[PDB]
Structures are given as C-alpha cells and as structure tokens.
Design a protein around this ligand. Structure first.
Ligand SMILES: Cc1ncsc1-c1ccc([C@H](C)NC(=O)[C@@H]2C[C@@H](O)CN2C(=O)[C@@H](NC(=O)C2(F)CC2)C(C)(C)C)cc1
Lengths: 142, 104, 87
C-alpha cells in the first residue's frame, strides 16, 4: 500500500544528518518492502541519486529509533528546480520523556535482563517493544 | 538571545529564562514577582561570586552556550533577614541509588 | 507570569512556568498552585523540569535539536516518573 512509484524520473537529493545518531536511510521499494542503504555518520552528508515519487524514512542505525526528515516522517524527492538538488534535513525529534528514558535503559541493559529490573511489568513490556520499521509502517498507513 | 537558568536558594529552585542582554537587577525583579522579596533584599551569585546589579547576564558568564534548556545554568540567591543578609546556601539534590548490576 | 510549585519527595521546591507544567496531563489534573510528589525525589524532579523547558523550546523548530541528556544513574527512576506523569 505504502510504496514508491516507478516513475523513472531521476531526482538528486542530499541526505544531511543533523543528529548525533548514525542514520540508516530506508527506501520502500515498489512492493512496499523496506530496503536498507549505507549508513550516515553524525554530521555528515551524502549527495545521492533517487527518483520522483520514491518513499524514504530514516532511523537510528543502531537502535532503530525513529528520526525526522524535513520535520516529518516520510521524505519524497520532488522535481529539481534549476538543477538544484533537494535537501533532506535529518534531525532528532522531540522524544517523549518516557521514550527517551526507554532508549537510555535499552542501551544499558541486555534484553534478557529486562525482567531483572525492578519496575512495573507495564514498563517491562514497553522496554521489549523495540522501535521497528515494520511496526511503524503499519501505523503510518493510518 | 535566551539564556535558561536555575535560580536556587535553600530548597527552592526557580526555572526561568531571560535575555543575555538583560541585567542582574531585572532578574531580581523576576525573583521579586515569584518569591515576593524586593531586589534590595536579594543577592545573586555565579558560583561564590557576587553579581553586580547593572551588569548584563552575558557579562556574568550566562550565555546560550552555557545556559541551555536541557542544562540550565545555576544562579545562587541569598535573602536579607531584617538588617543583615544571610550566607549563600544551596541544598543539593538527593543522591541517586547505586548502579544496578544489570545496568553495570 | 503565572508559576506553579512542584515539591519533590525530599522537600525540594521547584518553581516552573504554568504552561510548562501543563504539558503533563497528570499534573494538570492535580492542579485542577502547589503539587506534592510523594514518590519523585529531587534529582528526578529537577530533570523533569529540565525536560519541560527542553520541550517548549524545541517543539516546532527547524533549528538543530540537541539530545536530551539522561544519566544512567537516574534513568530507571526518571522512566517511572515519566510513566506516571505521561510526558
Ligand atoms: C552511499 C549512501 N549513503 C546513504 S544512501 C547511499 C546511496 C547508495 C546508492 C544509491 C543508488 C545509486 N540509487 C538508488 O538506489 C535509487 C534510490 C531509490 O529511489 C531507489 N533507487 C533505484 O535505483 C531502483 N531503480 C529504479 O528506480 C529505476 F531505475 C526506475 C527503474 C533500484 C531497484 C533500487 C535499483 C543511492 C544512495
């Protein structure tokens, strides 16, 4: 349902990582399957070749935490005006305090030791519910 | 340019923001509206150093680089009991528990 | 400027802007100008107040968003407080 269109119309874009995370670009192919692409170190940029109508989303390459591109979830390359390529500003979102805490706790304790932590069982289930691209893709389809 | 501060005295902490170009006295007027004490009865500090009323917050080392929203700079406050001022006292926050073995 | 007072479990009194504390739905319920937190110590409540400022400043902003720092020693308690306050 949520897939890239096979337009065959090239579109040059710059993937610019304005975040302290290693960014994993994710392209949704013509069947809606997510295809990973080479990662972006923090503060670095990449001038890449894409096509109009293609679907992109970006995430932390290590923990799959969601990220924002141009202050939204999905980036679609548009028409290049005067040969100027499109800018894809990849930034950190304002996480909830709950999710931000989960990120820090996930990065410190092994998933097998989630039960060994002294927390409410509801928080234990929230810790194991890792941010997954497949989970957000179903949610992104409203 | 906005600076983000923690005005602290005893067990009181005021979270607020101000301009880098604003003065120490104008910050005392902010404390006045919150703690109901006039500026002539307050003394503001950066670490142990007394702050002059006419100097700007930026001149006293309060910049956007050092006074961020996620890590605000601390401004010490001392009140005047009748005739003489008190000494600058700031109650430290509670100590967190030791790191669990599962976290270490 | 309207302010509210949030008191930690160890008596520390934190004074924040009213709109800053109203972003937490739980706190909004206990207000309707002082709220006592019998379970949240000061080293956790101070970080919560820092998130209020961090959120109000950096929502709907094209400026580069910085990472909200959370020390590992307070991560577990802050998570429980964030869960309770729903923010
Ligand atoms: C180093 C680095 N760091 C972060 S990204 C990065 C990097 C690396 C290589 C590329 C290549 C050159 N470009 C693409 O993969 C584009 C982007 C996306 O739109 C899909 N795509 C395609 O070419 C598709 N083909 C077609 O569309 C047609 F030709 C119309 C039929 C497929 C089927 C995948 C071949 C881009 C970025």
């Amino acid at each position: 349902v949520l897939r890239s269109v096979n337009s065959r119309e090239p579109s040059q874009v710059i993937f610019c990582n304005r975040s302290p995370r290693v960014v994993l670009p994710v392209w949704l192919n013509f069947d809606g399957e997510p295809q990973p692409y080479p990662t972006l170190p923090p503060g670095t940029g990449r001038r890449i070749h894409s096509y109009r109508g293609h679907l992109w989303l970006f995430r932390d390459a290590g923990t799959h935490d969601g990220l924002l591109v141009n202050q939204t979830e999905l980036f679609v390359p548009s028409l290049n005006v005067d040969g100027q390529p499109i800018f894809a500003n990849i930034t950190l979102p304002v996480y909830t305090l709950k999710e931000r805490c989960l990120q820090v706790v996930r990065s410190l304790v092994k998933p097998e030791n989630y039960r060994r932590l002294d927390i409410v069982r509801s928080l234990y289930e929230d810790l194991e519910d890792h941010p997954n691209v497949q989970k957000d893709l179903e949610r992104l389809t409203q | 340019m906005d600076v983000f501060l923690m005005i602290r005295r005893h067990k009181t902490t005021i979270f607020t923001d101000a301009k880098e170009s604003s003065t120490v006295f104008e910050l005392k007027r902010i404390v006045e509206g919150i703690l109901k004490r006039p500026p002539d009865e307050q003394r503001l500090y950066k670490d142990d150093q007394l702050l002059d009323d006419g100097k700007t917050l930026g001149e006293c080392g309060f910049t956007s680089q050092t006074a961020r929203p996620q890590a605000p700079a601390t401004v010490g406050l001392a009140f005047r009991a009748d005739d003489t001022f008190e000494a600058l006292c700031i109650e430290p926050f509670s100590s967190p528990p030791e790191l669990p073995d599962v976290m270490k | 400027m309207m302010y509210v007072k949030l008191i930690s479990s160890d008596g520390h009194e934190f004074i924040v802007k009213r709109e800053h504390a109203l972003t937490s739905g739980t706190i909004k319920a206990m207000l309707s100008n002082e709220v006592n937190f019998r379970e949240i110590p000061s080293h956790v409540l101070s970080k919560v107040c820092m998130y209020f400022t961090y959120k109000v400043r950096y929502t709907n902003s094209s400026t580069e968003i910085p990472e909200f720092p959370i020390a590992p020693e307070i991560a577990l308690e802050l998570l429980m407080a964030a869960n309770f306050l729903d923010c």
